[PDB]
mmCIF file of C-alpha atoms and ligand atoms in Angstrom:
data_model
loop_
_atom_site.group_PDB
_atom_site.id
_atom_site.type_symbol
_atom_site.label_atom_id
_atom_site.label_comp_id
_atom_site.label_asym_id
_atom_site.label_seq_id
_atom_site.Cartn_x
_atom_site.Cartn_y
_atom_site.Cartn_z
ATOM 1 C CA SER A 90 -42.003 -23.280 12.191
ATOM 2 C CA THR A 91 -41.461 -22.533 8.619
ATOM 3 C CA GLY A 92 -40.485 -19.788 6.641
ATOM 4 C CA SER A 93 -41.145 -19.015 2.610
ATOM 5 C CA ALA A 94 -39.541 -16.409 0.790
ATOM 6 C CA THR A 95 -39.614 -15.157 -3.364
ATOM 7 C CA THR A 96 -35.961 -14.925 -4.307
ATOM 8 C CA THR A 97 -35.806 -12.230 -7.212
ATOM 9 C CA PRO A 98 -32.903 -12.115 -9.994
ATOM 10 C CA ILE A 99 -31.190 -8.452 -9.597
ATOM 11 C CA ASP A 100 -30.859 -8.016 -13.505
ATOM 12 C CA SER A 101 -31.669 -9.679 -16.420
ATOM 13 C CA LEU A 102 -28.938 -12.073 -16.437
ATOM 14 C CA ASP A 103 -29.438 -13.609 -13.199
ATOM 15 C CA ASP A 104 -26.083 -12.333 -11.809
ATOM 16 C CA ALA A 105 -27.597 -12.709 -8.308
ATOM 17 C CA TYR A 106 -30.784 -13.170 -6.374
ATOM 18 C CA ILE A 107 -32.272 -10.846 -3.700
ATOM 19 C CA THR A 108 -34.633 -11.641 -1.008
ATOM 20 C CA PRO A 109 -36.417 -9.816 1.352
ATOM 21 C CA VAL A 110 -35.509 -10.006 5.018
ATOM 22 C CA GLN A 111 -37.113 -7.866 7.851
ATOM 23 C CA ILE A 112 -34.726 -6.884 10.469
ATOM 24 C CA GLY A 113 -35.743 -5.382 13.699
ATOM 25 C CA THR A 114 -38.540 -3.790 15.309
ATOM 26 C CA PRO A 115 -40.503 -2.214 13.630
ATOM 27 C CA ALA A 116 -39.134 -4.254 10.376
ATOM 28 C CA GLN A 117 -36.724 -2.554 8.387
ATOM 29 C CA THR A 118 -37.095 -4.587 5.209
ATOM 30 C CA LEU A 119 -33.669 -5.072 3.259
ATOM 31 C CA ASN A 120 -33.097 -7.025 0.314
ATOM 32 C CA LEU A 121 -29.992 -9.510 1.052
ATOM 33 C CA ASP A 122 -27.951 -11.863 -1.277
ATOM 34 C CA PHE A 123 -28.553 -15.335 0.423
ATOM 35 C CA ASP A 124 -25.170 -17.109 0.076
ATOM 36 C CA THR A 125 -24.686 -20.533 0.667
ATOM 37 C CA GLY A 126 -21.088 -20.119 0.305
ATOM 38 C CA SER A 127 -20.337 -17.925 3.228
ATOM 39 C CA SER A 128 -21.479 -17.245 6.829
ATOM 40 C CA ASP A 129 -22.377 -13.682 7.799
ATOM 41 C CA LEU A 130 -25.397 -11.627 7.585
ATOM 42 C CA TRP A 131 -24.302 -8.337 7.122
ATOM 43 C CA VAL A 132 -26.208 -5.166 5.956
ATOM 44 C CA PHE A 133 -25.311 -1.842 4.768
ATOM 45 C CA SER A 134 -26.377 0.388 7.531
ATOM 46 C CA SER A 135 -26.429 4.307 8.977
ATOM 47 C CA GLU A 136 -22.809 3.290 10.232
ATOM 48 C CA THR A 137 -21.475 2.470 6.420
ATOM 49 C CA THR A 138 -19.386 5.069 5.092
ATOM 50 C CA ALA A 139 -21.259 7.666 3.521
ATOM 51 C CA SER A 140 -19.296 7.619 -0.023
ATOM 52 C CA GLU A 141 -19.510 3.990 -0.030
ATOM 53 C CA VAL A 142 -23.460 4.071 -0.363
ATOM 54 C CA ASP A 143 -24.886 4.418 -3.216
ATOM 55 C CA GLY A 144 -28.847 3.390 -3.147
ATOM 56 C CA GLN A 145 -28.906 0.371 -1.025
ATOM 57 C CA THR A 146 -31.459 0.297 1.474
ATOM 58 C CA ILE A 147 -29.628 0.720 5.161
ATOM 59 C CA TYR A 148 -30.337 -0.957 8.385
ATOM 60 C CA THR A 149 -30.344 1.862 11.600
ATOM 61 C CA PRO A 150 -30.256 0.107 14.961
ATOM 62 C CA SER A 151 -31.063 3.117 16.503
ATOM 63 C CA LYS A 152 -34.504 2.863 14.963
ATOM 64 C CA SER A 153 -35.073 -0.561 16.017
ATOM 65 C CA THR A 154 -36.379 -1.141 19.509
ATOM 66 C CA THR A 155 -34.787 -4.674 19.811
ATOM 67 C CA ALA A 156 -31.396 -3.677 18.587
ATOM 68 C CA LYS A 157 -28.802 -4.316 21.475
ATOM 69 C CA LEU A 158 -25.068 -3.635 20.220
ATOM 70 C CA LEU A 159 -22.809 -6.908 20.590
ATOM 71 C CA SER A 160 -20.163 -5.390 22.455
ATOM 72 C CA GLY A 161 -16.673 -5.487 21.506
ATOM 73 C CA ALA A 162 -17.405 -7.727 18.638
ATOM 74 C CA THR A 163 -16.168 -7.191 14.829
ATOM 75 C CA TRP A 164 -16.066 -8.760 11.637
ATOM 76 C CA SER A 165 -14.376 -8.428 8.478
ATOM 77 C CA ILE A 166 -14.820 -10.651 5.262
ATOM 78 C CA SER A 167 -13.105 -11.278 2.248
ATOM 79 C CA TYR A 168 -14.931 -13.206 -0.592
ATOM 80 C CA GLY A 169 -13.707 -15.278 -3.483
ATOM 81 C CA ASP A 170 -14.352 -12.621 -6.085
ATOM 82 C CA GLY A 171 -11.824 -9.999 -4.201
ATOM 83 C CA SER A 172 -14.398 -8.235 -2.583
ATOM 84 C CA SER A 173 -14.816 -7.154 1.124
ATOM 85 C CA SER A 174 -16.612 -5.677 3.990
ATOM 86 C CA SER A 175 -16.386 -5.044 7.797
ATOM 87 C CA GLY A 176 -18.111 -3.413 10.765
ATOM 88 C CA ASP A 177 -19.299 -3.882 14.198
ATOM 89 C CA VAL A 178 -22.462 -6.412 15.243
ATOM 90 C CA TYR A 179 -25.519 -6.125 16.904
ATOM 91 C CA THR A 180 -28.011 -8.536 17.867
ATOM 92 C CA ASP A 181 -31.804 -8.030 16.629
ATOM 93 C CA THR A 182 -34.837 -9.781 15.214
ATOM 94 C CA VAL A 183 -34.764 -11.156 12.108
ATOM 95 C CA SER A 184 -37.671 -12.678 10.054
ATOM 96 C CA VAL A 185 -37.432 -14.537 6.552
ATOM 97 C CA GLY A 186 -40.591 -15.454 4.917
ATOM 98 C CA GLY A 187 -42.686 -15.739 8.162
ATOM 99 C CA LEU A 188 -39.681 -17.385 10.486
ATOM 100 C CA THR A 189 -38.318 -15.428 13.026
ATOM 101 C CA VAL A 190 -35.189 -15.500 14.775
ATOM 102 C CA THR A 191 -34.657 -13.407 17.831
ATOM 103 C CA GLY A 192 -31.111 -12.228 18.738
ATOM 104 C CA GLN A 193 -29.473 -12.874 15.422
ATOM 105 C CA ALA A 194 -26.440 -11.121 14.701
ATOM 106 C CA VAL A 195 -26.642 -8.573 12.147
ATOM 107 C CA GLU A 196 -23.317 -7.473 10.923
ATOM 108 C CA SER A 197 -23.431 -3.784 10.565
ATOM 109 C CA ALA A 198 -21.064 -2.965 7.689
ATOM 110 C CA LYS A 199 -18.838 0.354 8.381
ATOM 111 C CA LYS A 200 -16.813 -0.226 5.165
ATOM 112 C CA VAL A 201 -17.809 -2.200 1.911
ATOM 113 C CA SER A 202 -15.632 -2.613 -1.362
ATOM 114 C CA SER A 203 -16.460 -0.809 -4.254
ATOM 115 C CA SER A 204 -18.262 -3.748 -6.080
ATOM 116 C CA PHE A 205 -21.048 -3.674 -3.179
ATOM 117 C CA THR A 206 -21.171 0.196 -3.617
ATOM 118 C CA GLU A 207 -21.691 -0.165 -7.072
ATOM 119 C CA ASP A 208 -24.769 -2.491 -7.027
ATOM 120 C CA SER A 209 -27.617 -0.619 -5.784
ATOM 121 C CA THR A 210 -29.792 -3.744 -5.766
ATOM 122 C CA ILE A 211 -28.069 -5.675 -3.070
ATOM 123 C CA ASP A 212 -28.527 -4.804 0.516
ATOM 124 C CA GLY A 213 -26.318 -7.217 1.965
ATOM 125 C CA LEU A 214 -25.583 -10.900 2.526
ATOM 126 C CA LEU A 215 -27.433 -13.634 4.467
ATOM 127 C CA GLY A 216 -24.839 -16.518 4.782
ATOM 128 C CA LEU A 217 -26.111 -19.962 4.597
ATOM 129 C CA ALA A 218 -22.941 -22.012 4.893
ATOM 130 C CA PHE A 219 -21.973 -23.515 8.401
ATOM 131 C CA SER A 220 -21.338 -21.196 11.217
ATOM 132 C CA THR A 221 -17.496 -22.210 11.488
ATOM 133 C CA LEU A 222 -16.837 -19.723 8.826
ATOM 134 C CA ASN A 223 -18.329 -16.702 10.519
ATOM 135 C CA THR A 224 -16.271 -14.137 11.033
ATOM 136 C CA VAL A 225 -17.197 -12.229 13.777
ATOM 137 C CA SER A 226 -14.576 -11.763 16.687
ATOM 138 C CA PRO A 227 -14.189 -12.466 19.413
ATOM 139 C CA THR A 228 -17.143 -14.328 19.635
ATOM 140 C CA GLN A 229 -18.314 -16.191 16.557
ATOM 141 C CA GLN A 230 -22.249 -15.828 15.703
ATOM 142 C CA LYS A 231 -24.434 -18.707 14.460
ATOM 143 C CA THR A 232 -25.989 -18.278 10.765
ATOM 144 C CA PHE A 233 -29.603 -17.494 10.575
ATOM 145 C CA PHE A 234 -30.149 -20.937 9.606
ATOM 146 C CA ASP A 235 -28.394 -22.243 12.781
ATOM 147 C CA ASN A 236 -30.574 -20.169 14.898
ATOM 148 C CA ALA A 237 -33.545 -21.136 13.726
ATOM 149 C CA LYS A 238 -33.145 -24.860 13.080
ATOM 150 C CA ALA A 239 -34.177 -26.169 16.415
ATOM 151 C CA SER A 240 -37.674 -24.408 15.910
ATOM 152 C CA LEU A 241 -38.163 -25.851 12.115
ATOM 153 C CA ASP A 242 -40.354 -28.262 11.485
ATOM 154 C CA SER A 243 -37.314 -30.360 9.734
ATOM 155 C CA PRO A 244 -33.666 -29.042 10.025
ATOM 156 C CA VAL A 245 -33.686 -28.186 6.326
ATOM 157 C CA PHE A 246 -33.804 -25.323 3.837
ATOM 158 C CA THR A 247 -34.263 -25.415 0.253
ATOM 159 C CA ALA A 248 -32.951 -23.429 -2.829
ATOM 160 C CA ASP A 249 -35.534 -23.360 -6.279
ATOM 161 C CA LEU A 250 -33.889 -20.360 -8.082
ATOM 162 C CA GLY A 251 -35.311 -19.296 -11.391
ATOM 163 C CA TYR A 252 -34.073 -18.966 -14.534
ATOM 164 C CA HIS A 253 -34.734 -15.477 -15.748
ATOM 165 C CA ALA A 254 -37.730 -15.425 -13.026
ATOM 166 C CA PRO A 255 -38.169 -15.520 -9.339
ATOM 167 C CA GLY A 256 -37.552 -18.362 -7.314
ATOM 168 C CA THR A 257 -38.015 -19.514 -3.719
ATOM 169 C CA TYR A 258 -36.155 -20.395 -0.449
ATOM 170 C CA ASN A 259 -37.954 -22.510 2.081
ATOM 171 C CA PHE A 260 -37.061 -23.280 5.314
ATOM 172 C CA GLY A 261 -38.574 -26.055 7.678
ATOM 173 C CA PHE A 262 -39.912 -27.983 4.678
ATOM 174 C CA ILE A 263 -39.434 -29.410 1.469
ATOM 175 C CA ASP A 264 -42.213 -28.212 -1.113
ATOM 176 C CA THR A 265 -42.971 -31.662 -2.859
ATOM 177 C CA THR A 266 -45.015 -29.631 -5.733
ATOM 178 C CA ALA A 267 -41.817 -28.063 -6.701
ATOM 179 C CA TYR A 268 -40.005 -30.637 -8.381
ATOM 180 C CA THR A 269 -40.429 -33.482 -10.518
ATOM 181 C CA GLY A 270 -39.443 -36.681 -9.989
ATOM 182 C CA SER A 271 -37.452 -37.835 -6.780
ATOM 183 C CA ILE A 272 -35.041 -35.955 -4.885
ATOM 184 C CA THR A 273 -31.424 -37.687 -4.777
ATOM 185 C CA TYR A 274 -29.115 -37.231 -1.899
ATOM 186 C CA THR A 275 -25.446 -36.920 -1.817
ATOM 187 C CA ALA A 276 -22.996 -36.850 1.080
ATOM 188 C CA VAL A 277 -21.667 -33.288 2.221
ATOM 189 C CA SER A 278 -18.293 -32.518 4.031
ATOM 190 C CA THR A 279 -18.544 -29.644 6.514
ATOM 191 C CA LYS A 280 -14.786 -29.686 6.643
ATOM 192 C CA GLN A 281 -14.141 -26.561 5.235
ATOM 193 C CA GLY A 282 -17.570 -24.898 6.122
ATOM 194 C CA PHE A 283 -19.126 -25.221 2.803
ATOM 195 C CA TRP A 284 -21.874 -27.354 1.105
ATOM 196 C CA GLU A 285 -19.220 -29.712 -0.286
ATOM 197 C CA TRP A 286 -20.278 -32.687 -2.168
ATOM 198 C CA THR A 287 -18.989 -34.821 -5.234
ATOM 199 C CA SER A 288 -20.708 -34.985 -8.333
ATOM 200 C CA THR A 289 -20.448 -38.029 -10.226
ATOM 201 C CA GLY A 290 -19.637 -36.951 -13.802
ATOM 202 C CA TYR A 291 -20.802 -34.866 -16.486
ATOM 203 C CA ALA A 292 -22.210 -34.793 -20.086
ATOM 204 C CA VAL A 293 -22.033 -31.843 -22.948
ATOM 205 C CA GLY A 294 -24.961 -31.871 -24.690
ATOM 206 C CA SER A 295 -26.252 -35.205 -26.304
ATOM 207 C CA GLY A 296 -22.550 -36.774 -25.607
ATOM 208 C CA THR A 297 -22.287 -39.617 -23.447
ATOM 209 C CA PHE A 298 -21.925 -39.436 -19.712
ATOM 210 C CA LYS A 299 -18.106 -39.510 -18.102
ATOM 211 C CA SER A 300 -18.056 -40.704 -14.977
ATOM 212 C CA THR A 301 -15.569 -38.947 -12.712
ATOM 213 C CA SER A 302 -15.584 -37.351 -9.229
ATOM 214 C CA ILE A 303 -16.124 -33.650 -9.108
ATOM 215 C CA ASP A 304 -15.582 -32.238 -5.799
ATOM 216 C CA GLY A 305 -17.049 -29.069 -5.305
ATOM 217 C CA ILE A 306 -19.423 -26.682 -3.344
ATOM 218 C CA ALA A 307 -23.144 -25.454 -3.795
ATOM 219 C CA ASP A 308 -22.932 -22.088 -3.666
ATOM 220 C CA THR A 309 -25.904 -19.592 -4.286
ATOM 221 C CA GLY A 310 -23.916 -16.393 -4.235
ATOM 222 C CA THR A 311 -21.784 -17.478 -6.910
ATOM 223 C CA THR A 312 -23.172 -16.414 -10.376
ATOM 224 C CA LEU A 313 -21.613 -18.938 -12.494
ATOM 225 C CA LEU A 314 -20.352 -22.729 -12.538
ATOM 226 C CA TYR A 315 -16.798 -23.447 -12.205
ATOM 227 C CA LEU A 316 -15.435 -26.881 -12.914
ATOM 228 C CA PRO A 317 -11.957 -28.463 -13.950
ATOM 229 C CA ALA A 318 -10.228 -27.079 -16.956
ATOM 230 C CA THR A 319 -10.649 -30.313 -18.685
ATOM 231 C CA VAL A 320 -14.260 -30.366 -18.271
ATOM 232 C CA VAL A 321 -14.505 -26.861 -18.990
ATOM 233 C CA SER A 322 -12.744 -27.333 -22.345
ATOM 234 C CA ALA A 323 -14.565 -30.141 -23.526
ATOM 235 C CA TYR A 324 -17.838 -28.005 -23.235
ATOM 236 C CA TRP A 325 -16.526 -25.266 -25.255
ATOM 237 C CA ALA A 326 -15.203 -27.503 -27.760
ATOM 238 C CA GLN A 327 -18.592 -28.257 -28.776
ATOM 239 C CA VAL A 328 -19.017 -24.397 -29.368
ATOM 240 C CA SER A 329 -17.608 -23.216 -32.807
ATOM 241 C CA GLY A 330 -15.630 -20.159 -32.631
ATOM 242 C CA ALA A 331 -15.499 -20.414 -28.445
ATOM 243 C CA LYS A 332 -12.248 -19.517 -26.730
ATOM 244 C CA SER A 333 -10.691 -18.720 -23.678
ATOM 245 C CA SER A 334 -9.753 -15.115 -23.426
ATOM 246 C CA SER A 335 -6.782 -14.006 -21.329
ATOM 247 C CA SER A 336 -7.988 -10.372 -21.487
ATOM 248 C CA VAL A 337 -11.845 -10.739 -20.812
ATOM 249 C CA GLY A 338 -11.017 -13.255 -17.905
ATOM 250 C CA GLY A 339 -12.435 -16.636 -19.125
ATOM 251 C CA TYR A 340 -14.501 -18.705 -22.145
ATOM 252 C CA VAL A 341 -16.512 -16.535 -24.588
ATOM 253 C CA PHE A 342 -18.423 -17.377 -27.667
ATOM 254 C CA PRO A 343 -20.026 -15.824 -30.770
ATOM 255 C CA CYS A 344 -23.161 -14.456 -29.770
ATOM 256 C CA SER A 345 -24.652 -16.081 -32.685
ATOM 257 C CA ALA A 346 -24.230 -19.641 -31.432
ATOM 258 C CA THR A 347 -26.771 -21.905 -29.975
ATOM 259 C CA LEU A 348 -25.046 -23.600 -26.910
ATOM 260 C CA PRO A 349 -25.323 -27.298 -25.780
ATOM 261 C CA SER A 350 -26.753 -28.475 -22.591
ATOM 262 C CA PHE A 351 -24.506 -29.653 -19.782
ATOM 263 C CA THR A 352 -25.353 -32.590 -17.505
ATOM 264 C CA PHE A 353 -23.926 -32.882 -14.051
ATOM 265 C CA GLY A 354 -24.330 -36.051 -11.949
ATOM 266 C CA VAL A 355 -25.695 -36.446 -8.551
ATOM 267 C CA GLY A 356 -25.252 -39.926 -7.368
ATOM 268 C CA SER A 357 -26.923 -42.130 -10.272
ATOM 269 C CA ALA A 358 -29.298 -38.943 -11.010
ATOM 270 C CA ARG A 359 -28.384 -36.305 -13.806
ATOM 271 C CA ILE A 360 -29.380 -32.821 -13.612
ATOM 272 C CA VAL A 361 -29.512 -31.207 -16.957
ATOM 273 C CA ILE A 362 -28.635 -27.259 -17.483
ATOM 274 C CA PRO A 363 -30.059 -26.144 -20.702
ATOM 275 C CA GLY A 364 -27.539 -24.367 -23.167
ATOM 276 C CA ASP A 365 -29.658 -21.154 -22.432
ATOM 277 C CA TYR A 366 -28.512 -20.746 -18.736
ATOM 278 C CA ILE A 367 -25.122 -21.120 -19.909
ATOM 279 C CA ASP A 368 -25.315 -17.583 -21.871
ATOM 280 C CA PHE A 369 -24.241 -14.561 -19.780
ATOM 281 C CA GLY A 370 -24.595 -12.238 -23.074
ATOM 282 C CA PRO A 371 -22.322 -9.618 -24.538
ATOM 283 C CA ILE A 372 -19.135 -8.903 -22.828
ATOM 284 C CA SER A 373 -19.774 -5.163 -23.349
ATOM 285 C CA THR A 374 -22.800 -3.337 -24.828
ATOM 286 C CA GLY A 375 -22.907 -3.971 -28.100
ATOM 287 C CA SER A 376 -20.260 -6.678 -28.674
ATOM 288 C CA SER A 377 -20.985 -10.054 -30.374
ATOM 289 C CA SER A 378 -18.776 -11.711 -28.151
ATOM 290 C CA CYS A 379 -20.898 -13.350 -25.312
ATOM 291 C CA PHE A 380 -19.518 -14.463 -21.614
ATOM 292 C CA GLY A 381 -19.873 -18.489 -21.073
ATOM 293 C CA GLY A 382 -21.566 -19.226 -17.696
ATOM 294 C CA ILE A 383 -19.304 -22.400 -17.615
ATOM 295 C CA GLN A 384 -15.718 -21.422 -16.420
ATOM 296 C CA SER A 385 -12.617 -23.274 -15.049
ATOM 297 C CA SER A 386 -12.121 -22.984 -11.228
ATOM 298 C CA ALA A 387 -8.209 -23.868 -12.229
ATOM 299 C CA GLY A 388 -7.356 -20.337 -10.349
ATOM 300 C CA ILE A 389 -9.874 -20.807 -7.779
ATOM 301 C CA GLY A 390 -8.804 -23.498 -5.674
ATOM 302 C CA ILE A 391 -12.163 -25.065 -5.580
ATOM 303 C CA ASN A 392 -14.970 -26.182 -8.038
ATOM 304 C CA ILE A 393 -18.216 -24.010 -7.574
ATOM 305 C CA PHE A 394 -21.731 -25.279 -8.333
ATOM 306 C CA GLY A 395 -22.876 -21.564 -8.454
ATOM 307 C CA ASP A 396 -26.479 -20.485 -9.963
ATOM 308 C CA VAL A 397 -25.983 -21.598 -13.410
ATOM 309 C CA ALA A 398 -26.071 -25.199 -11.894
ATOM 310 C CA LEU A 399 -28.316 -24.823 -8.980
ATOM 311 C CA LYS A 400 -31.158 -22.896 -11.268
ATOM 312 C CA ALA A 401 -31.361 -26.232 -13.059
ATOM 313 C CA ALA A 402 -32.713 -28.030 -9.655
ATOM 314 C CA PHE A 403 -34.489 -28.026 -6.415
ATOM 315 C CA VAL A 404 -32.073 -27.957 -4.028
ATOM 316 C CA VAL A 405 -32.031 -29.346 -0.547
ATOM 317 C CA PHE A 406 -29.735 -28.251 2.074
ATOM 318 C CA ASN A 407 -30.208 -30.824 4.753
ATOM 319 C CA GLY A 408 -28.848 -29.515 8.057
ATOM 320 C CA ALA A 409 -29.371 -32.733 10.291
ATOM 321 C CA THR A 410 -26.766 -34.105 12.714
ATOM 322 C CA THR A 411 -25.082 -35.219 9.517
ATOM 323 C CA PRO A 412 -25.630 -32.954 6.681
ATOM 324 C CA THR A 413 -26.898 -33.797 3.360
ATOM 325 C CA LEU A 414 -27.461 -32.038 -0.265
ATOM 326 C CA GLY A 415 -30.138 -33.216 -2.131
ATOM 327 C CA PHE A 416 -31.144 -32.655 -5.772
ATOM 328 C CA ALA A 417 -34.167 -32.861 -7.883
ATOM 329 C CA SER A 418 -35.333 -32.258 -11.598
ATOM 330 C CA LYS A 419 -37.745 -29.764 -12.187
HETATM 331 C C1 R9J B 501 -22.785 -6.818 -5.226
HETATM 332 C C2 R9J B 501 -21.931 -8.333 -5.174
HETATM 333 C C3 R9J B 501 -20.746 -7.974 -4.889
HETATM 334 C C4 R9J B 501 -20.131 -9.172 -4.713
HETATM 335 C C5 R9J B 501 -20.827 -10.249 -4.717
HETATM 336 N N1 R9J B 501 -19.884 -11.767 -4.668
HETATM 337 C C6 R9J B 501 -19.847 -12.446 -3.474
HETATM 338 C C7 R9J B 501 -21.235 -12.973 -3.186
HETATM 339 C C8 R9J B 501 -19.337 -11.368 -2.496
HETATM 340 C C9 R9J B 501 -18.825 -13.561 -3.388
HETATM 341 O O1 R9J B 501 -18.922 -14.372 -2.611
HETATM 342 O O2 R9J B 501 -17.947 -13.579 -4.671
HETATM 343 C C10 R9J B 501 -21.893 -10.450 -4.909
HETATM 344 C C11 R9J B 501 -22.890 -9.438 -5.101
#
């Protein structure tokens, strides 16, 4: 089997991408935020505290003839941005782009933190990291991809995120028309439960490539590119007037600037992020200070190849017995 679904930016900045997901029978379609940095499929639901729901579409298990309470199971997750959610668990039929999994754990939120409530465009998350990170207790549950894997033509999914445009998540096949040149594959460590890999270096604009190992994660649920402070300082030093602002929370730059590209290495291959992808617009409406799309990871504990980086590539998440990542230009 295979599946193919379009993923759509939630706003004009590509802050996140939503993909329609069919849950239950008859289908309830919710727009979920496919996260390769986490491993829970959770949804706004009829059980979510009413004051914490503000425009999201909810899953109502009592209206699904295939829903079953997973008795005794609870979940609770805290993300790297400080947001969180928790609740109980149903199993139900879940379909993405024509690919159907029966018995998928659907984590129904009883509580969500304020950033979820305040974003009406996101109805939940679909985790695509390794199932070892799934938070369901006392019986850990598998991700949608792990449940689908055995049925897929090939045990892979691909992320093809658009710049200011829709893109595609494919399951079970690699669309050879979706990229240029060849796909360069690179080793993955699953020791932390992430799609963790080592970039071979970087360049700023037309500058020389610096060969240096940068360990980080491929994370479709993170908006920006978070790299070591040395690398980030080297980038922003090429933008007149750019500075790190403690009050704003990162590097800002004059909105009048033209940003240089940023290149990252994948083996001997190179992925070029155009400068325009690094512009996240005014820090507040009407400001002439703009927020940068490359930020320091120093306060995180891990480097994160988020959407800014991934949208410059066609990315293969190869879930074979020994997982690997593939990157191609497009
Ligand atoms: C509405 C919303 C709220 C939070 C996030 N951040 C997530 C994906 C949870 C993270 O892992 O940092 C994304 C969207």
